[PDB]
Design an enzyme around this catalytic site. Structure first.
Site, PDB file in Angstrom:
ATOM      1  N   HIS A   1     -18.134  67.213  20.078  1.00 49.94           N
ATOM      2  CA  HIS A   1     -18.255  65.976  20.864  1.00 49.94           C
ATOM      3  C   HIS A   1     -17.599  66.077  22.261  1.00 49.94           C
ATOM      4  CE1 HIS A   1     -14.253  64.193  20.298  1.00 49.94           C
ATOM      5  NE2 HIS A   1     -14.327  64.439  18.992  1.00 49.94           N
TER       6      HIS A   1
ATOM      7  N   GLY B   1      -7.124  61.781  23.160  1.00 43.89           N
ATOM      8  CA  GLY B   1      -6.796  63.120  23.640  1.00 43.89           C
ATOM      9  C   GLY B   1      -6.300  64.061  22.550  1.00 43.89           C
TER      10      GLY B   1
ATOM     11  N   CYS C   1      -8.014  64.845  19.812  1.00 44.04           N
ATOM     12  CA  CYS C   1      -9.158  65.551  19.225  1.00 44.04           C
ATOM     13  C   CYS C   1      -9.055  67.040  19.436  1.00 44.04           C
ATOM     14  CB  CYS C   1     -10.474  65.005  19.768  1.00 44.04           C
ATOM     15  SG  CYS C   1     -10.762  63.269  19.371  1.00 44.04           S
TER      16      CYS C   1
HETATM   17  O1  LIG Z   1     -12.024  58.631  17.847  1.00 46.34           O
HETATM   18  C1  LIG Z   1     -11.852  59.188  18.933  1.00 46.34           C
HETATM   19  C2  LIG Z   1     -13.016  59.637  19.796  1.00 46.34           C
HETATM   20  C3  LIG Z   1     -14.336  59.564  19.062  1.00 46.34           C
HETATM   21  C4  LIG Z   1     -15.027  58.362  18.956  1.00 46.34           C
HETATM   22  C5  LIG Z   1     -16.170  58.265  18.176  1.00 46.34           C
HETATM   23  C6  LIG Z   1     -16.643  59.373  17.491  1.00 46.34           C
HETATM   24  C7  LIG Z   1     -15.968  60.570  17.622  1.00 46.34           C
HETATM   25 CL1  LIG Z   1     -16.528  61.965  16.742  1.00 46.34          CL
HETATM   26  C8  LIG Z   1     -14.836  60.684  18.405  1.00 46.34           C
HETATM   27  N1  LIG Z   1     -10.634  59.472  19.446  1.00 46.34           N
HETATM   28  C9  LIG Z   1      -9.398  59.350  18.768  1.00 46.34           C
HETATM   29  C10 LIG Z   1      -8.983  60.302  17.840  1.00 46.34           C
HETATM   30  N2  LIG Z   1      -7.857  60.184  17.129  1.00 46.34           N
HETATM   31  C11 LIG Z   1      -7.102  59.100  17.339  1.00 46.34           C
HETATM   32  C12 LIG Z   1      -7.412  58.100  18.243  1.00 46.34           C
HETATM   33  C13 LIG Z   1      -8.585  58.229  18.975  1.00 46.34           C
HETATM   34  C14 LIG Z   1      -8.977  57.160  19.960  1.00 46.34           C
HETATM   35  F1  LIG Z   1     -10.106  56.535  19.608  1.00 46.34           F
HETATM   36  F2  LIG Z   1      -8.055  56.197  20.083  1.00 46.34           F
HETATM   37  F3  LIG Z   1      -9.156  57.638  21.192  1.00 46.34           F
END
Ligand SMILES: O=C(Cc1cccc(Cl)c1)Nc1cnccc1C(F)(F)F
Ligand SMILES: [Cl-]
Lengths: 298, 301
Positions: B41, B143, B145
């Protein structure tokens, strides 16, 4: 989202761990530049008399599969400093700092100079640490990372009869009224780190847990009377000032959060949890909460 | 003595963390040998996440569209390929800090350490467990990921997880290092929800044996149970079924403490019924399920 007990990345400290052997005793040493720091009980008490009988070659220092040759030795408080011929090429930028009770740090638990695990812990108000250590863990170190600088704050020396641990700063000064020797020693009555519980309540509000909030406030004096009743450390104006940023971020005044804490102390959690815990967590400082709820890197 | 949630020393993984940038998106990559592994992604926009066609987005990219940074050194991308939900960026420099490693796919109940990273810089390390619902209760911000989950067995790093996303309940979803997601999740901003989570029974039993090893026996009782009766009771508390495999796995801990697995199951049944009555077990007022039988044997002995 999420709130975990997080340790600093241990890599900068892993590159410093060595095994120190003297006679039948094997423990861990911290190799920084051309000096190996380790507990002075490795020679075991009259430590000046035990040390004077030792020659440089009596100390076997092993860094991985390489034997370091000891060219000098000196004692500084309860820490033995073994001067070695080779400077550690992996020496990070570092400081030796003495921490206060309530402050937290990461511990790289080691056995035979090999790191086995890393965990986060707090220096209890009774100067002990509730660590996880087995025989051979002596010499394992506690640290914080601030930018690229490792601040070494703890060196493991012993386990007390209640399962808790006692150690020194890297200058060999014990935390707590402990001595390095097999004698009747007991940890004092422990107390809860109030500023840390409040920091963890702010972390819960930031992560969407607000059930414990109420419309009430309290004076610092009234909160301190209630807190003294529940074996909680007194909350000072300094603690209130330190919680300022978290109070401004969540919109909950420190004495307003204190009123929530009073209600939890007087009435319990009532089958509820806060950040997946049925107990009030006191091993996250206000700074740990800010760092984890902002993503600070090293 | 003592029982802590202990993570593996993160040094071997820290030396592999890089920052991967594609357009406006910046996340973490794992640099092993001459390959950088990161979530696919990274090639997506925010207005692409609903129904991204990764094959179509990737074909429009060239090597120089991917900026990879290892510390203050920019790595040159000389090739790229997609394997399931991970992007593999071939770089012109092999990582000199590459440890001995394996890619392992874990099962629910397994634990691992997470090196949470932002901009290719590690910020923290914590211990995690793959929940029965295939999510992980992590601590991740935007950030994060590309941050990885791992176990260290002797000198070998077994990479088992790569962070991809956060679900609406605050829990996290990701893949193994071959890009296969754990659970029924997709790398799409579509309505996805974690299934009802359950307690990892074999792990709670392991933690009760850890408590007995550390001198806590207050919760034991004079009863035993059949495996079926235990499971009938356990399911009512949202506990995972305990299988004969779990009972076999608890054999060593049963032999060390002298408490039969079904005898420990009877204490668990009682703890579920009574609660702790103001008491704690290994400093916890809740039954801990993020320590495996292997973790208990490693830390208590
Ligand atoms: O979830 C995401 C990004 C995202 C969105 C929809 C689908 C995908 Cl595969 C990836 N980031 C994230 C990750 N781990 C923690 C928080 C976050 C936050 F959303 F806050 F940025
Ligand atoms: Cl597994």
């Amino acid at each position: 989202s999420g709130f975990r007990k997080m340790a600093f990345p241990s890599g900068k400290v892993e590159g410093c761990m060595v095994q120190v052997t003297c006679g039948t005793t094997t423990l861990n040493g911290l190799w920084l530049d051309d000096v190996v720091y380790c507990p002075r009980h490795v020679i075991c008490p009259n430590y000046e008399d035990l040390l004077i009988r030792k020659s440089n070659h009596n100390f076997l220092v092993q860094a991985g599969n390489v034997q370091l040759r000891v060219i000098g030795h000196s004692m500084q408080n309860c820490v033995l400093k073994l001067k070695v011929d080779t400077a550690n090429p992996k020496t990070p930028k570092y400081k030796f700092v003495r921490i206060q009770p309530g402050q937290t740090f990461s511990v790289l638990a080691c056995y035979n100079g090999s790191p086995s695990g890393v965990y986060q812990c707090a220096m209890r108000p009774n100067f002990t640490i509730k660590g996880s250590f087995l025989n051979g863990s002596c010499g394992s170190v506690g640290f914080n990372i601030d930018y690229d600088c490792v601040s070494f704050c703890y060196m493991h020396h012993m386990e007390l009869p209640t399962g808790v641990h006692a150690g020194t700063d890297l200058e060999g000064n014990f935390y707590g009224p402990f001595v390095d020797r097999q004698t009747a020693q007991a940890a004092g009555t422990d107390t809860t780190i109030t500023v840390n519980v409040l920091a963890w309540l702010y972390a819960a509000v930031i992560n969407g847990d607000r059930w414990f909030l109420n419309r009430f406030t309290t004076t610092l004096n009234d909160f301190n009377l209630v807190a003294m009743k529940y074996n909680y450390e007194p909350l000072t104006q300094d603690h209130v000032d330190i919680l300022g940023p978290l109070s401004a971020q969540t919109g909950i005044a420190v004495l307003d959060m204190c009123a929530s804490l009073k209600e939890l102390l007087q009435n319990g959690m009532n089958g509820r949890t806060i950040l997946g815990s049925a107990l009030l967590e006191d091993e996250f400082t206000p700074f740990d909460v800010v760092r984890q709820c902002s993503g600070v890197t090293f």
